[PDB]
Design a protein around this ligand. Structure first.
Ligand SMILES: COC(=O)c1sccc1NC(=O)Cc1cccs1
Lengths: 322, 10
């Protein structure tokens, strides 16, 4: 028997024996993630048991899709998949898929609250943008970047966890339900950078109504060319709000909050004013953000269908052995 | 340019 079972909450992880001392570090939709020691690599890893991958076609095609993308979108700033396996030894039996990934040291939640120099601030942002660029290259728009989704190591390396609650980092066009593009994820980057500087969630609130208010309170009402673009119902709420001018970037992010230092401060603020843009058509792109003076200092080119359940099991199993 | 190699997560 190559496998053993460990009970984790109301879940059992049946894992290869090389994975030892399993302990929970995550609990969220998709499910329990356990940290573990990998005896063969002499390294800590994270093990995720996919949730009910053969519950239905929808779950199956999404499992298969998750597998293929993790197996071939590799990059220094996306958490790498180290192994995948099943404890079941036939298709008849096949139920569970286990993903083994890199384990870093922490979330951004920690780091956001600590005060960081421009070097670290902007190097972290550079890595974020690079990881996001590779995702998009692979055709993956994240839509839910946030600090708990982004992980860091003690040598200032940064990776993005995966690809889709805290709704504070989600872009206005999601909030408003208007459809979205790649630079949906630039807003989130703006929110995380803003919070790194101010040390407080930029746009809190109970719900999306409260959310929007904080956005307009601080950034000002978007213009009519944004509103026209809204579905009529959402356009009628959004046009009845107070017509705020916005607090302006120098006052949302004064020199005071920062640690060249004045024209590193003002570069940071300029980058923030180009990401924290309500209108996606007027918001900076990943390529442009990477090209910004604040981030560009680190630039290194080297870094920048219908099937039955049975039929899906066949395809997924092929991927597990790969 | 020399990128940082430390981050005090501790
Ligand atoms: C819950 O799932 C995860 O947090 C995953 S999944 C692959 C890595 C990590 N976490 C890390 O690398 C570092 C950490 C973040 C939070 C605790 S430790």
């Amino acid at each position: 028997n190559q496998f053993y079972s460990v009970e984790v909450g109301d879940s059992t992880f049946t894992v290869l024996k090389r994975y030892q001392n399993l302990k929970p570090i995550g609990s969220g939709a998709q499910g329990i993630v356990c940290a573990a020691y990998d005896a063969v690599l002499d390294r800590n890893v994270a093990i995720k048991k996919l949730s009910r991958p053969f519950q239905n076609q929808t779950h199956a095609k999404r499992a298969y899709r998750e597998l293929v993308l993790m197996k071939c979108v590799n990059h220094k700033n996306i958490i790498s998949l180290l192994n995948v396996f099943t404890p079941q030894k036939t298709l008849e039996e096949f139920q569970d898929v286990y993903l083994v990934m890199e384990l870093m040291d922490a979330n951004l939640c920690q780091v956001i609250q600590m005060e960081l120099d421009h070097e670290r601030m902007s190097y972290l942002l550079y890595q974020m943008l690079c990881g996001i660029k590779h995702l998009h290259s692979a055709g993956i728009i994240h839509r839910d970047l946030k600090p708990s989704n982004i992980v860091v190591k003690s040598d200032c390396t940064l990776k993005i966890l995966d690809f889709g609650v805290t709704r504070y980092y989600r872009a206005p066009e999601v909030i408003l339900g208007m459809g979205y593009k790649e630079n949906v994820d630039i807003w989130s980057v703006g929110c995380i950078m803003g919070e790194m500087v101010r040390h407080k969630i930029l746009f809190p609130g109970r719900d999306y109504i409260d959310q929007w208010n904080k956005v307009i309170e601080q950034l000002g009402t978007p213009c009519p060319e944004f509103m026209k673009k809204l579905q009529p119902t959402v356009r009628n709420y959004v046009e009845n709000r107070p017509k705020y001018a916005g607090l302006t970037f120098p006052k949302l992010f004064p020199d005071s909050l920062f640690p060249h230092n004045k024209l590193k401060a003002s570069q940071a603020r300029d980058l923030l004013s180009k990401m924290l843009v309500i209108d996606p058509a007027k918001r900076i792109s990943v390529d442009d953000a990477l090209q910004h003076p604040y981030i560009n200092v680190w630039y290194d080119p080297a870094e920048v269908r219908e099937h039955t359940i049975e039929e899906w099991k066949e395809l997924i199993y092929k991927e597990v052995m790969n | 340019p020399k990128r940082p190699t430390t981050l005090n997560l501790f």
